[PDB]
Design a protein around this ligand. Structure first.
Ligand code: ZN
Lengths: 71, 157, 137, 139, 139, 49, 62, 97
RNA sequence: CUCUGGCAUGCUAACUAGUUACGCGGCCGUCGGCGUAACUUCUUAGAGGGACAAGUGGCGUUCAGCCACGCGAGACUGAGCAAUAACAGGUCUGUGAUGCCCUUAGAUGUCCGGGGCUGCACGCGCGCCACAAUGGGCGGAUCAACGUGUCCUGCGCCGACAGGCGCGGGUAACCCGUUGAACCCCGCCCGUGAUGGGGACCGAUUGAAACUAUUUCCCGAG
């Protein structure tokens, strides 16, 4: 269905599946984790500081993140 | 001496589809103009550029190649090769240019209807249409329309 | 002030006005919407401190601006319902109180020609804040 | 020491001034890096990206544009400063240096030096705009 | 701190009206009749509540303060023009009506003109509209 | 008596030629009928271009 | 079953069809010039262009 | 000190007035300023062609060209009455200040 | 032919349009801050220059011309005007253009009061606004052309805002006005859910006579 907040059971599931995706954007995390968009954008700010994802370009319409140090 | 990318030794395999050379050694202009359509997006070129600029990012990060080499590969493999007219039905070859015109029209329309009834960003669906149209992934919209127009052309001839 | 981002300047200038609590910040700051063409209240609580930052910045570009000329800056496309939308000016009171808030500080002054201009002290602090934000990056 | 040329797309006229400065261009006191739109930034850098950063290091450019819209001005000032350097090299330097910089600009885009005489056509009664007409009702 | 709390209730029955715990603190109370989007963002600002929360994040302590400002807003310096009912026909005091109150409040005006047999009153009885406009083709 | 105040609204302005209250042209100070201004358009100085 | 053959237009004969949408031209192969066939073309085509005909067997009857 | 304006509708009559005004002042050897050209003001009247209703929605858009030409002179007004008295021209209007 | 659009560090011009120097003041180069010297590129508009299928090539009895291509502000753009003959097309309701007929004091003349022209089971046509994913919502920040003005507005003050109270300019390239328009741009919010998309229908003003809510303003419903 839909979820506005985050659940502790699915909390750890995000740290192991989102950094593994090639395209990391709230439009993709929303479809795969049933996140209602707003929580998806704020979740990437938490992942950005922890070092799991890195920012390549940030815009008011669409933000893109990549896999952190995978080469 | 370099444009938005390096594009070292751009390869155009087919000789017939060798018309868009304005950015090679402009297709980037025509792809931005063909996206602003369907009424409520007319007269917004800068809006489509941000969609294309974000599309090149998704293409460059998903494939280890130049972003332009996926755009040309999409229109060169999704371009039609036979149409059916009203002869009063023969498989008519289109053009070296009509293949470029109709393929881009199918790419913009593909990400349009697939993102209207779904919650997806246009900048993502455009990049998704290019990777699906290349090599004929059998799941895109341009390939599904190309194979359909070629199947009906062979039947009524 | 032109060598820096005008959005980053108004954001850095908004903190300077809130740091020194010598402004007016009236009581009705959080009940009124900023214009009749808008529908809801602003999202930021301290919109008055940001509006006063952009208001004093426009005086640097061109002086002699009053209340009737500031509401023309802060105008939008008013959704008239089923009627085609049009341009509608902002509110004169929220713009007058901002101009009066800058009068409490030694940043703006009333010129005899009409409207409001900047003071030798107003341009002093306006350029240093633009200078410290230029050295940021 | 005195070069003033206008660059117009539709109605916006941009008078570019080319003086013996130090090589730091700025639009009427504002640097060309903070002019909206942010995407239409390379268009101002075209006379400085494909052209080497050694001919503009001896001139100062301060332009003033009036009229048109946002896109009508970003295309106006890039043409204003392009025709500015070609006029300075004509009045005081040899044409071999001037003709060399003209071929490199036109080879990239023709609208960088040649002005576009296109204007908006007048509206004709019977419909919105010039060509389009109101819907006709049969029977 | 985005983890869901244990006190997160999806439905908070307030004034015999259900409140979904999915939207923000303002747009959730809009479902209650008599309180719209404009009246929600005000009563939540006078109560010093974080606007970046959801309806399920406010416990019973925060809810009672929000409803208290909703009932009698004149005691919290909320102006009279912002109210729904300003000068009642039978009460005559500035009091913003609520969900279960407006159904009885609006029907009094419909019955007052019906009992008094006014031209504006008979139209509500005939099943027609009290027209400020034409009704030739609009069904 | 026998004088009703008419200075604001349709009924105080009329064509200065045919005394009509339809198709008035009162911009720039003409106050003429639309079917009568064309008759004197060449005399006033208005030409078609 | 025949392979997809490429063909270069050597001379355009003019616009044909019912509504004038097709352009009957004569093509010329690049690998082997031992075959010449006329084919209708639907779309703007310059001189010397290359089309990709599939059947390469049936004619158009002018 | 005096600003002479020339209000005319037809350019042929306007250019002839400003010609003799400069020559009419040249004989007194006065430091006169060149004639300036004010923006031409046209008056648009978009009238329906049909007298009443029946037609094909045809509008005839009239225009009225109003030209203005200024000539600035700094000279005493003692004997300028006769200078303007020899500037008679139908269709034009001179308003000295 | 007329009109309009098009491009000379060109000519003719400019304190009701400016620009470049200089002085002065503010600020850490910036300044539509101020003041007078040069100038007419930018602005305004006067005349005359320019563009003809003139050069290149091809095709065509070689003509008429067409196609392609140098050089170029154009290989040109839109508009106005537009025959002969005709129509039982529209207009007696635009005329103090008008034939005939009718009415003419208890008037079909016109002055005033009231209502209707807006009245609805429905049909049609021209449009508006939407059914949002390319959007909506709140900030900030950059931009104008034909216009209009006795009535448009400027500034202070008051006001949730519509407005209201005061002080001025503009009969106009002068004031409004460097037309600080929306779309677009830069952040944030919302997340496909008739929702924050869409809005029908349902006390505070303003010019009068708010009945039949002229319309606006706020809140709610929607
Ligand atoms: Zn008349």
């Amino acid at each position: 269905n839909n979820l506005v907040l985050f659940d502790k059971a699915t909390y750890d599931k995000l740290y192991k599946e989102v950094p593994n995706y090639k395209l990391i954007t709230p439009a993709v995390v929303s479809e795969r984790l049933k996140i209602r968009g707003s929580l998806a954008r704020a979740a990437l700010q938490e992942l950005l500081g922890k070092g799991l994802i890195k920012l390549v370009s940030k815009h008011r319409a669409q933000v893109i993140y990549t896999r952190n140090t995978k080469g | 001496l370099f444009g938005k990318w390096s594009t070292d030794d751009v390869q155009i395999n087919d000789i017939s589809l060798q018309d868009y050379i304005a950015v090679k050694e402009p297709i980037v202009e025509r792809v931005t103009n063909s996206m602003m359509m369907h009424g409520r997006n007319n007269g917004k070129k800068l809006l489509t550029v941000r969609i294309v600029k974000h599309a090149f990012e998704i293409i460059h990060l998903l494939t280890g190649e130049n972003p332009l080499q996926i755009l040309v590969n999409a229109i060169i493999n999704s371009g039609p090769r036979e149409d059916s007219t009203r002869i009063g039905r023969q498989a008519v070859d289109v053009s070296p240019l009509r293949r470029v015109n109709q393929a881009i029209w199918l790419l913009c329309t593909g990400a349009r209807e697939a993102a209207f009834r779904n919650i997806k960003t246009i900048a993502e669906c455009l990049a998704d249409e290019l990777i699906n149209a290349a090599k004929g992934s059998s799941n895109s919209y341009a390939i599904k329309k190309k194979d359909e127009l070629e199947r009906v052309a062979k039947s009524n001839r | 002030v032109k060598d820096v981002n005008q959005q980053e300047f108004v954001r850095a200038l908004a903190a300077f006005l809130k740091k020194s609590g010598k402004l007016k910040v009236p009581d009705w700051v959080d009940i009124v919407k900023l214009a009749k063409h808008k529908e809801l209240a602003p999202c930021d609580e301290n919109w008055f401190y940001i509006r006063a930052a952009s208001t004093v910045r426009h005086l640097y570009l061109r002086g002699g601006v009053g209340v009737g000329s500031m509401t023309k800056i802060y105008g939008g496309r008013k959704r008239n319902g089923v009627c085609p939308s049009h341009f509608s000016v902002g509110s004169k009171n929220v713009a007058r109180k901002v101009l009066q808030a800058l009068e409490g500080l030694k940043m703006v002054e009333k010129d005899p020609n009409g409207g409001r201009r900047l003071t030798p002290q107003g341009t002093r602090d306006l350029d240093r804040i633009a200078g410290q934000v230029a050295a940021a990056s | 020491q005195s070069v003033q040329v206008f660059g117009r797309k539709k109605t916006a006229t941009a008078v570019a001034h080319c003086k013996r400065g130090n090589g730091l261009i700025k639009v009427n006191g504002r640097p060309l890096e903070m002019i909206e739109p942010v995407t239409l930034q390379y268009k101002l850098l075209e006379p400085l990206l494909l052209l080497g950063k050694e001919r503009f290091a001896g001139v100062d450019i301060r332009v003033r544009v009036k009229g048109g819209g946002h896109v009508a001005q970003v295309y106006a000032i890039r043409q204003a400063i392009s025709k500015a350097l070609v006029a300075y090299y004509q009045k005081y330097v040899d044409e071999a240096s001037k003709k060399e910089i003209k071929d490199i600009l036109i080879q990239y885009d023709r609208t960088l030096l040649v002005a576009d005489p296109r204007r908006c056509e007048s509206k004709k009664f019977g419909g919105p705009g010039a060509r389009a007409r109101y819907q006709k009702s049969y029977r | 701190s985005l983890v869901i709390p244990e006190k997160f209730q999806h439905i908070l029955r307030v004034l015999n009206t259900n409140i979904d715990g999915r939207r923000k603190i303002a747009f959730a109370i809009t479902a209650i009749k008599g309180v719209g989007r404009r009246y929600a963002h005000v009563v939540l600002r006078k109560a010093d509540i974080d606007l970046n929360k959801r309806a399920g994040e406010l416990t019973e302590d925060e809810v009672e303060r929000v409803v208290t400002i909703m009932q009698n807003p004149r005691q919290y310096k909320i102006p009279d023009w912002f109210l729904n009912r300003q000068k009642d026909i039978k009460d005559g005091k500035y009091s913003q009506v609520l969900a279960n109150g407006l159904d009885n409040k609006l029907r009094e005006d419909l019955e007052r003109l019906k009992k008094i047999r006014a031209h504006r009153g008979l139209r509500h009885f005939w099943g027609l509209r009290v027209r400020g406009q034409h009704t030739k083709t609009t069904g | 008596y026998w004088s009703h105040p008419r200075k604001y609204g349709q009924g105080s302005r009329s064509c200065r030629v045919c005394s009509n209250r339809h198709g008035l042209i009162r911009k720039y100070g003409l106050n003429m009928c639309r079917q009568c201004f064309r008759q004197y358009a060449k005399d006033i100085g208005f030409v078609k271009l | 079953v025949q392979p997809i053959k490429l063909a270069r237009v050597t001379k355009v004969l003019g616009r044909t069809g019912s509504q004038g949408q097709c352009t009957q031209v004569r093509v010329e192969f690049m690998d082997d010039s031992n075959r010449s066939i006329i084919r209708n073309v639907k779309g703007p085509v310059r001189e010397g262009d290359v089309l990709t005909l599939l059947e390469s067997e049936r004619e158009a009857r002018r | 000190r005096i600003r002479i304006t020339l209000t005319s509708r037809n350019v042929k009559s306007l250019e002839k007035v400003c010609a003799d005004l400069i020559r009419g002042a040249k004989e007194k050897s006065l430091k006169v300023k060149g004639p300036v050209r004010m923006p031409t003001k046209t008056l648009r009247i978009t009238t329906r062609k049909t007298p009443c209703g029946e037609g094909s929605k045809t509008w005839d858009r009239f225009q009225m060209r109003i030209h203005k030409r200024l000539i600035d002179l700094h000279s005493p007004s003692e004997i300028v009455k006769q200078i303007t008295s020899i500037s008679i021209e139908p269709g034009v209007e001179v308003e000295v200040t």
